[PDB]
Design a protein around this motif. Structure first.
Motif: not given
Ligand SMILES: [Zn+2]
Ligand SMILES: [Zn+2]
Ligand SMILES: [Zn+2]
Ligand SMILES: [Zn+2]
Lengths: 135, 436, 44, 82, 44, 257, 49, 468, 67, 49, 114
Positions: C3-8
């Motif tokens: 996911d883009q927001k979960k790049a960490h």
RNA sequence: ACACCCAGCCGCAA
């Protein structure tokens, strides 16, 4: 001071090389007898060694410190510049001995540590360059 | 508006004779960045001197290096009196000159310094042009009648400046020559002696002109000075390279081929070693191998196998080295000390040798076998990593894969340990930066 | 990769730009493996 | 301090040699009088080195002892290592 | 201002800043012809 | 103290290869004559090319390089045309250069091979070597190539397209007599073409009073110049260079005195 | 705290080790005919610097 | 239970193109397999139809004379990556040292390793504002503000460069001007050290419907003496010097070498497979067939190749007598001669050169920027300043970090240590917090340290300048 | 790509022999006899004709961008 | 898929190109296979510390 | 981008002379020719022709650098024979050398052609 | 009188 017979030791100016230079500059002949009185060698070494200063002073503490710092070069100097060794294998002359004393004084004064030299960074760089050669 | 009154500053272009400073990461020590003089040349690269490549730990295979130009009368002068490569030939790391003849000029000095080389008048005639410190007087030749021939030792005596006295020994010095007679005759022409600035006998090598303590360049620095040593290095690199332009150096297949008798002897030694390791593993199979005290039975078995194979590789390397001719360039490159080693000669010609991973031999990745081709439960030479063949003869795929493992670990260790050495560097030098 | 927001927590290094300097380089980059490691044991 | 009780190595080392040879040459660069006769050269470094050989450099060196007390040395009583 | 199209190769001028098209094929990739101005090339 | 007396003998004088033997001559003279063969022999070659239209897949630089290295015959008029730098003419003139016109257009299904024959000159004495022909570029249907080219005068020091030789071979002392090469295993080396030994002997015996002489040449032209006039042009160029050195040295020694 | 941090930060990667004007970097090439102190510089670098 | 289909399928795509890899050393095989991806040449056949950044293509690719049976299955024969080159392994002059090479300027003038460097740029009319729009047009000298001194007359009326024209460094190549919220010149510029030629330019529509274009600039690269070269055996090298044909050695038959590699590249990094390549290449070029060099073959060894070469009239070990190019005298040793496969590498001498002199400056650091593309300056790292600490050149080390990088002047109070305001024209030096108008001291100190101590003062830390 | 006009080492004409080389290869001749029939005694031009792969037939299979 | 040499050359696509790469915004992207520990398999390991 | 144009290997621009004469001070009766914009092609000839002269002690050549198209020739003769006129004789017999070789090659070509 | 904002990632050089 030295156990295990480790005769290899680092000293400032290479005595045998300057003796050979004094032999091959003034064109002396080892076959012929030389004209060099033994006490000229004796008080030449004694008067030389009083002018190799490391700990400069007059009080006995600084004198003891200077003797301690100069001791290894002095104990090699008196052994190499002995009267019997000079009379047998070196066969130097009087002005050859005077040039030898002056030029060893010049070399030792050149080889003294220069004040203002950063020893710590040089020491870290020197001790740390072989770190990349246990590969 | 271009009138120049006194007190102005003019930013000229960097003309020749200016002083700049070169750098190569990583800067491990204080030899790794230091000053030079600017000489303007065509094309688009930095062109630096050949023996200077040993201080900056570099190679001319893609290395790109930095430049720094001072702009101050303070700064140019202090670099000219501190960071110049003439003034700093020797390093205080181990009181030996890291400024050293390397890679080509050393192995050409070796062939130019021998007894057998003799130059006609037309050869010495051109070699005396490439000097800079030459007094302008042609020396008397060592041979006059029938025809005037100059030996190379008088030429290198003309190279040596002032009056340098030095006694070194050549690399292939026979240890029995000093005890017996001909101590100062040296029928192998070892025992390099330099007398009053005149080369007297000896062939020069790495132990005389290279980065060694008490070498000829070290004495030249400690007696003549610092400028004279720079002229000495430049004169060597001119005249020896231009003599090599005539005489020529090479390497090829003919420097790797040994005799048929040599090949038979190497194969017999390999067969005897394999028979002996079969014998000792047969003794270990029937449980008669007494364990070494303080050692595991597997440990002492591995130690015995490693000892036998190392004795075999030492013997085959000695045979390969004895089989070398005088014209073999592989031998010349390693007796000169310019590059390579005798172990490389042994691996090229006779036998690559036993190959190891993290100290031990090739492990058992499969069900207690190194490869599916070999039988299970095998601790033999071929099955565990020994290379009976050589580079010239070609490798079987199993020993090729074991050599791939050896090269792989030789890449990994030098690719990961630079993190450690770079951290040791920073830690040691940040604490020591203020000690004076 | 994720996911883009979960790049960490998203694993990186996937889907590199294709190398086109050489046909051999292209065939090498098509057929390539990679390890999720950021010790020399897995490298051997 | 006075003339007596003055202790430091009398060999003028390479660091102050570089410092003096820089500063005085920059003084030529800023049109200061030159203490020596010169014969047809214009580089301030060359004339500064020539008059350092001539030992006619008109500055003094204030050396900082680690105790804190200063100690002043000129150029003409310091002797050149070269 | 002249232009050349993708496949059927009709020299369709535009000079109007309209969306690109042609009355023959209408393929929406256009190239421009090498101009009549003169350029020299050294043979070194 | 003075010059010696060289002799020449010619063994082969075919249309593209010349072998000659020069005797009683020092090594440096023969080496210099060999160097002048491939570096300082004048020749006419294309250096200035102008592309009008190039729709070929071979772009402008490919075509420019290929046209630059097409050999051109200069058997007689290489001396007449002056250098473009020494011409009082600005840019180019027919007296200082030769103009080439190339125009070709493919409108057929099969591949059109644009060869060196399609090159058209103005002076009939300059033409590419067709009197097989040299390929330049292949064209598909609907692809054009229109260009103009100018041919200057130059020698091999500027560029290799002005090198007139195909390849020169220089042999002296065929069977080894002066030990200029030291053979580690003399039996493993083949005998030279001009060797004068039997099968049993490997090398000639040592000659301490010898001197390198009897040079063997195998110079070969590329078809631009005749293989016999190239040697004459090389000797003339060397003579003119040393005459220029005479003039400059004489001017300097009268200027100093 | 990340701005003040070490490598690629302020005090190690920006200040104590920093970038400087009047510098050049180029691949290096052998030259026997130069002296030890001499070094070859291309004309473009000497012109721009 | 099973048999190997063939022992030479161990190697991968890169490692297959190395012939005799068993005769080499495994680090050298690893290096060349890493460098086989950097070998230029033809890469994809429709290279002129495609356009992309950093594309290389070579004049005359040649399939290797010394080949294995597996590169023919990788389709390496159709698209090679080098030229078989006549190579003399010799120490001729001295410019080959540290693995470097001497190449033939005569051959280089004939197309030897000459290549074409294709580069492409792209720009868009990314409309953001209501009236803040950029339109492809020729910029007029006074209607827009973003001026340089480049030649703006090379463009047409559409705002794009005409194909086939010659462009030099720092030239406008696409002319786009964005309108002010009269206009502002937001056009792209050709990067330094290019001197290329535009070849083919297109216009089209993007995914979001507006206009979008790409160009393509090509530049031929005659090999200068800095270019990176390697063999198929891990023979890393840069071009030392380019001699002409009259200066290099030559055989008795007139063969002059193309590339001279130093003989000491062999013994340390053991690359006997390169010598076997050279021998098999000589015998294959003399015979006519293409040399079979599969990695594992007992039918092919050095002895049969040596006998095949000796049958054809050469030295059986591959040596050959060469004569000196300058003197004309015979070289005393016998140089090892023969064709072999070298490759040209991506790393260019022209792309790697870089010079900086007080150019563009970073907005935050007030320091030189990050590398040649931005026209920035070289780094002088921690270990570099420690080198001056070892040397003892304090003022060089001061000039390298303060005077040339970022000199800056600040005003600070003397009672407190806090940085104070200072108006230059009205000369009203006044320190807030102390009511001090008579004691503010000028301090020369780097901008990096000022920004440092201002970040500390953002963290409620007080670094005080006690100048007294 | 395309055959060069000159051999890289010497400079012997190469560009007028590619069509002849294919013509002699089509008439059942081996590579050695075909190279000997073209007068290429030196191996430097033998490797030029032998090791050159032609790409123009691959490049002329594409439609031209102009007419 | 299924196109011959002639159809690929007519379509301005390289027949020699093996493919296997995506096109995202005009940039050729290829997925490199990423290893992971095998699923549904029982292992044994011995942590030293 | 720093590639020199190929014509400066033998052209001379405005500012330098073809021949410059320097008198060496290390040894009497010596000269330092500094022939500019030629190569080893001239220098090998000069060295060989001057070694052919018996009353010349030292006469050799070298190149300072292969980039800078410059050779230097140092000639030392006996103290009764100037090096400049020694160079002049070594060129004026060389002219006869090359002309005689050209004439003999011409007559060899004429005799070979029927 | 120059014009290009930065983070992140990746590949790669010695
Ligand atoms: Zn259309
Ligand atoms: Zn004209
Ligand atoms: Zn305050
Ligand atoms: Zn050829």
């Amino acid at each position: 001071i030295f156990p295990t017979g480790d005769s290899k030791v680092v000293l400032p100016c290479n005595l045998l090389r300057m003796i050979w230079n004094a032999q091959k500059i003034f064109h002396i002949n080892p076959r012929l007898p030389s004209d060099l009185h033994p006490i000229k060698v004796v008080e030449g070494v004694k008067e030389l060694s009083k002018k190799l200063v490391i700990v400069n002073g007059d009080d006995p503490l600084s004198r003891q410190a200077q003797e301690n710092a100069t001791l290894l070069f002095n104990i090699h100097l008196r052994s190499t510049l002995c009267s019997r060794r000079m009379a047998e294998e070196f066969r130097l002359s009087g002005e050859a001995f005077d040039w030898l004393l002056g030029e060893i004084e010049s070399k030792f004064n050149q080889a003294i540590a220069h004040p203002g030299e950063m020893v710590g960074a040089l020491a870290a760089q020197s001790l740390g360059e072989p770190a990349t050669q246990m590969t | 508006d271009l009138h120049l009154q006194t007190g102005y500053k003019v930013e000229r272009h960097m003309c020749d004779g200016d002083i700049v400073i070169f750098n190569r990461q990583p800067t491990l020590h204080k030899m790794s960045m230091m000053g030079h003089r600017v000489r303007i040349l065509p094309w688009s690269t930095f062109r630096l001197n050949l023996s200077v490549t040993t201080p900056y730990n570099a190679d001319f295979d893609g290395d790109e290096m930095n430049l720094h130009l001072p702009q101050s009368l303070e700064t140019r002068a202090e670099i000219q009196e501190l960071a110049m490569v003439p003034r700093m030939i020797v390093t205080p790391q181990s009181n030996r000159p890291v400024m050293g003849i390397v890679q080509d000029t050393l192995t050409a000095v070796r062939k130019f310094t021998k007894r057998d080389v003799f130059l006609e008048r037309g050869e010495v005639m051109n070699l005396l042009m490439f000097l800079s410190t030459w007094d302008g007087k042609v020396p008397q030749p060592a041979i006059l009648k029938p025809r005037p021939l100059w030996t190379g030792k008088q030429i290198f005596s003309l190279i040596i400046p002032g009056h340098i006295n030095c006694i070194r020994t050549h690399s292939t010095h026979p240890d029995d020559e000093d005890s017996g007679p001909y101590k100062h005759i040296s029928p192998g022409d070892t025992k390099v002696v330099v007398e009053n600035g005149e080369l007297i006998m000896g062939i020069l090598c790495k132990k005389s002109l290279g980065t060694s303590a008490g070498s000829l360049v070290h004495i030249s620095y400690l007696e003549m000075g610092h400028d004279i040593t720079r002229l000495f290095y430049s004169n060597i690199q001119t005249v020896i390279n231009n003599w090599l332009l005539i005489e020529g150096h090479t390497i090829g297949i003919g420097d790797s081929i040994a005799d048929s008798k040599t090949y038979q002897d190497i194969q017999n030694t390999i067969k005897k070693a394999k028979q002996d390791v079969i014998e000792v593993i047969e003794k270990a199979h029937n449980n008669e191998l007494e364990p070494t005290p303080g050692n595991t039975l597997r440990q002492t078995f591995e130690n015995q196998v490693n000892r036998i194979l190392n004795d075999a590789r030492d013997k085959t390397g000695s045979s390969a080295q004895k089989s070398l001719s005088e014209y073999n360039n592989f031998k010349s490159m390693v007796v000169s000390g310019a590059k390579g080693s005798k172990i490389n000669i042994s691996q090229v010609i006779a036998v690559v040798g036993q190959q190891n991973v993290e100290g031990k031999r090739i492990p058992f990745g499969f069900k207690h076998r190194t490869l599916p081709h070999f039988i299970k439960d095998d601790y033999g030479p071929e099955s565990r990593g020994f290379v009976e063949n050589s580079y010239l003869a070609g490798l079987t795929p199993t020993e090729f894969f074991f050599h791939a493992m050896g090269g792989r670990e030789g890449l990994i260790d030098t690719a990961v340990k630079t993190a450690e050495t770079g951290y040791i560097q920073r830690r040691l030098i940040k604490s020591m930066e203020s000690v004076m | 990769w994720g996911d883009q927001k979960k790049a960490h927590q998203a694993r990186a290094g996937v889907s590199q730009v294709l190398n086109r300097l050489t046909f051999a380089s292209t065939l090498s980059h098509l057929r390539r493996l990679n390890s999720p490691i950021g010790l020399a044991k897995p490298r051997q | 301090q006075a003339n007596q009780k003055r202790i430091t190595t009398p060999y003028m080392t390479k660091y102050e040699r570089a410092r003096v040879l820089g500063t005085r040459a920059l003084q030529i660069a800023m049109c200061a009088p030159v203490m020596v006769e010169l014969e047809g050269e214009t580089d301030p470094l060359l004339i500064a080195m020539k008059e350092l050989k001539a030992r006619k450099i008109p500055i003094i060196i204030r050396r900082y002892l680690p105790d804190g007390s200063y100690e002043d040395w000129g150029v003409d009583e310091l002797i050149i290592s070269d | 201002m002249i232009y050349i199209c993708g496949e059927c190769h009709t020299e369709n001028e535009i000079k109007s800043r309209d969306p690109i098209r042609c009355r023959e094929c209408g393929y929406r990739i256009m190239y421009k012809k090498r101009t009549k101005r003169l350029v020299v090339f050294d043979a070194r | 103290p003075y010059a010696n007396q060289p002799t020449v003998r010619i063994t082969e004088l075919t249309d593209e290869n010349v072998k000659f033997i020069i005797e009683n001559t020092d090594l440096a003279v023969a080496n210099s004559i060999r160097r002048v063969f491939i570096a300082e022999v004048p020749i006419i070659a294309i250096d200035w090319v102008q592309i009008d239209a190039n729709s070929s897949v071979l772009h402008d630089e490919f075509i420019a390089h290929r046209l630059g290295l097409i050999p051109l015959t200069s058997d007689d008029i290489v001396d007449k045309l002056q250098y473009s730098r020494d011409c009082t003419c600005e840019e180019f003139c027919p007296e200082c250069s030769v103009e080439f016109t190339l125009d070709v257009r493919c409108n057929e299904d099969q591949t059109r091979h644009v060869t060196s024959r399609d090159l058209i000159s103005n002076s009939p004495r300059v033409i590419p070597v067709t009197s097989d022909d040299i390929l330049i570029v292949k064209l598909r249907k609907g692809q054009e190539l229109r260009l103009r080219a100018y041919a200057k005068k130059g020698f091999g020091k500027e560029h290799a397209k002005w090198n007139p030789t195909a390849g020169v071979a220089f042999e002296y002392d065929p069977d080894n007599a002066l030990r200029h090469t030291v053979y580690p295993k003399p039996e493993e080396w083949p005998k030279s073409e001009y060797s004068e030994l039997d099968e049993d002997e490997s090398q000639a015996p040592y000659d301490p009073n010898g001197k390198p002489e009897r040079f063997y040449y195998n110079v070969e032209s590329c078809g631009s110049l005749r293989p016999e006039t190239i040697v004459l042009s090389a000797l003339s160029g060397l003579k003119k260079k040393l005459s220029d050195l005479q003039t400059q040295l004489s001017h300097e020694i009268q200027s100093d005195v | 705290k990340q701005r003040l941090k070490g490598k690629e930060g302020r005090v190690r990667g920006n200040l104590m080790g920093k970038r400087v004007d009047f510098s050049a970097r180029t691949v290096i090439t052998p030259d026997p005919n130069l002296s030890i102190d001499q070094v070859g510089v291309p004309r473009s670098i000497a012109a721009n610097m | 239970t099973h048999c190997e289909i063939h022992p030479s399928m161990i190697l991968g795509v890169c490692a297959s193109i190395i012939p005799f890899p068993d005769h080499n050393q495994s680090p050298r095989n690893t290096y060349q397999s890493a460098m086989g991806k950097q070998a230029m040449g033809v890469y994809i056949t429709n290279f002129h139809v495609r356009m992309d950044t950093l594309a290389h293509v070579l004049y005359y690719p040649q399939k290797p004379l010394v080949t294995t049976r597996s590169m023919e299955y990788l389709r390496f024969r159709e698209l090679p990556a080098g030229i078989n080159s006549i190579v003399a392994i010799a120490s001729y002059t001295g410019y080959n040292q540290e693995d470097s090479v001497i190449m033939n300027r005569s051959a280089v003038d004939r197309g030897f390793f000459r290549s074409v460097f294709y580069r492409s740029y792209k720009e868009q009319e990314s409309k953001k504002g209501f009236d803040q729009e950029e339109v492809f047009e020729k910029p007029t000298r006074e209607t827009c503000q973003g001026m340089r001194h480049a030649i703006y007359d090379k463009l047409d009326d559409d705002g794009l460069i005409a194909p086939g024209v010659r462009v030099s460094g720092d030239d406008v190549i696409i002319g786009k001007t964005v309108t002010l919220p009269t206009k502002r010149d937001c056009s792209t510029f050709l990067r330094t050290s290019e001197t290329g030629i535009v070849d083919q330019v297109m216009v089209t529509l993007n995914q979001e419907g507006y206009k979008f274009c790409k160009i393509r600039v090509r530049s031929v690269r005659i090999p200068q003496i800095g270019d990176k070269f390697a063999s198929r055996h891990g023979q890393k090298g840069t071009c030392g010097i380019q001699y002409r044909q009259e200066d290099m050695p030559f055989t008795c038959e007139g063969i002059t070498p193309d590339i001279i590699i130093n003989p000491h590249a062999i013994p340390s990094r053991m690359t006997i497979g390169h010598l076997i390549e050279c021998l098999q290449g000589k015998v294959s070029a003399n015979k006519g067939e293409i040399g079979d060099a599969t990695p594992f073959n007992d039918a092919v060894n050095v002895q049969k190749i040596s006998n095949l070469l000796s049958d054809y009239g050469y030295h059986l070990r591959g040596n050959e007598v060469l004569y000196n190019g300058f003197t004309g005298r015979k070289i005393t040793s016998q140089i090892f001669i023969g064709p072999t496969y070298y490759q040209r590498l991506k790393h260019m001498v022209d792309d790697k050169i870089h010079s900086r002199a007080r150019g563009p400056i970073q907005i935050l650091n007030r320091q030189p920027m990050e590398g040649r593309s931005r026209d920035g300056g070289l780094r002088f790292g921690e270990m570099e300043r420690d080198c001056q600490i070892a040397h003892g050149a304090a003022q060089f080390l001061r000039e390298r970090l303060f005077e040339a990088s970022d000199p800056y002047q600040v005003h600070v109070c003397n009672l407190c240590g806090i940085m104070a305001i200072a108006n230059t024209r009205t000369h009203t030096y006044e320190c807030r917090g102390c009511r001090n108008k008579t004691q503010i001291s000028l301090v020369r100190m780097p901008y990096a340290c000022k920004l440092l101590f201002q970040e500390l003062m953002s963290m409620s830390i007080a670094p005080r300048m006690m100048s007294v | 790509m395309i055959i060069p006009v000159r051999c890289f080492t010497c400079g012997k004409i190469v560009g007028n022999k590619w069509e002849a080389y294919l013509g002699l290869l089509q008439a059942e001749y081996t590579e050695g006899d075909a190279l000997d029939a073209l007068g290429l005694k030196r191996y430097c031009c033998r490797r030029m004709l032998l090791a050159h792969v032609d790409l123009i037939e691959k490049l002329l299979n594409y439609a031209p961008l102009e007419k | 898929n299924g196109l011959t040499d002639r159809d690929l050359c007519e379509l301005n696509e390289c027949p020699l190109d093996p493919g296997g790469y995506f096109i995202i915004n005009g940039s050729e992207k290829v997925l490199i296979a990423q290893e992971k520990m095998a699923t549904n398999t029982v292992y044994v390991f011995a942590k030293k510390d | 981008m720093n590639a020199p144009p190929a014509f400066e290997s033998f052209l001379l621009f405005e500012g330098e002379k073809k021949i410059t004469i320097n008198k060496d001070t290390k040894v009497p009766n010596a000269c330092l020719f500094t022939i500019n914009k030629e190569d080893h092609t001239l220098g090998n000839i000069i060295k060989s022709q001057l070694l052919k002269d018996p009353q010349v002690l030292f006469a050799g050549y070298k190149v300072p650098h292969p980039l800078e198209h410059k050779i230097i020739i140092r000639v030392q003769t006996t103290p009764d024979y100037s090096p400049q006129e020694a160079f002049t004789n070594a060129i004026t017999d060389l002219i006869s050398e090359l002309s005689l070789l050209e004439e003999r090659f011409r007559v060899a070509i004429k005799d070979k052609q029927e």
